[PDB]
């Protein structure tokens with residue numbers, strides 16, 4: 121009876137790159153909004169909804185690494201941003217911290233979304249160390265501003281990409297690995313909303329776990345065979361790309377999807393993996409979906425919050 125509206129908003133260059141790559145991948149039932157100062161980059165956006173901010177400040181250029189210009193640009197386009205958001209039940213704001221537009225405009229966009237009634241999740245990167253300390257300090261201020269503006273925040277330090285590449289992995293391939301954090305989080309929530317579970321979770325449960333909750337982890341794991349449930353649960357909670365690990369989580373939304381063979385025993389095994397990894401007394405909202413078209417694969421979705 122309730123069908124939640126999810127939007128993904130890219131802010132600045134890195135955020136709009138993420139939006140374009142997610143659209144290429146193919147999302148469905150998610151709406152995308154592209155926000156930038158940089159008219160050149162914005163012109164190449166694949167997003168249905170595009171908002172050029174700050175044209176009077178920048179003349180259609182980017183913000184030249186000045187976050188105050190990104191912030192003013194967003195504020196002066198508040199009404200256009202409100203209009204594009206209106207109706208969203210959930211908004212993901214994605215941005216690369218450290219430049220001028222994401223750093224300054226992304227917290228404004230998040231504040232607007234939350235004031236408009238949307239559950240508001242930020243997924244942002246910190247710069248590579250090779251970009252230098254000024255970029256890092258500027259990024260840190262953006263992260264802090266994002267935390268103040270969102271319901272929950274996922275931070276991806278770009279330095280962690282250096283942990284998952286070999287000497288030849290293309291830069292674009294590494295970037296797609298960072299994108300997956302947002303894409304699979306969005307997809308997991310979309311699927312949770314769309315499908316009726318045997319133990320049914322819904323958007324009210326997402327809100328309980330994510331509303332006004334600080335740092336977050338969103339993870340998906342898929343596995344087959346023996347120890348599938350343990351293996352899928354470990355994959356869901358163990359991304360090498362995250363600033364915030366599962367350790368310390370006090371609230372967890374966990375959904376297990378499997379075929380008719382999904383056993384009670386393996387459901388407990390998977391839940392225990394998350395409980396034990398948290399190393400906390402976690403408040404868990406547990407769900408299950410039986411998809412008969414699944415044979416031997418199991419999918420574990422985890423949203424974790426409450427680090428404190």
Ligand SMILES: Nc1nc2c(ncn2[C@@H]2O[C@H](COP(=O)(O)OP(=O)(O)O)[C@@H](O)[C@H]2O)c(=O)[nH]1
Pocket residue numbers: 131132133134135137138158182183184185215216217218219220221222223245246247248251255278295298
């Ligand atoms: N992982 C990733 N990081 C990016 C990407 N584009 C930019 N960055 C990072 O994001 C930071 C800000 O860059 P950018 O978004 O282009 O600046 P802005 O347009 O002024 O918001 C950079 O310092 C990089 O660390 C991307 O596509 N993927």
Ligand code: BEF
Pocket residue numbers: 132133157158182183184185186219220221222
């Ligand atoms: F390119 Be960002 F606007 F500094």
Ligand SMILES: [K+]
Pocket residue numbers: 312313314315316317320321322
């Ligand atoms: K559901």
Ligand SMILES: [Mg+2]
Pocket residue numbers: 132133158182183219221
């Ligand atoms: Mg730019």
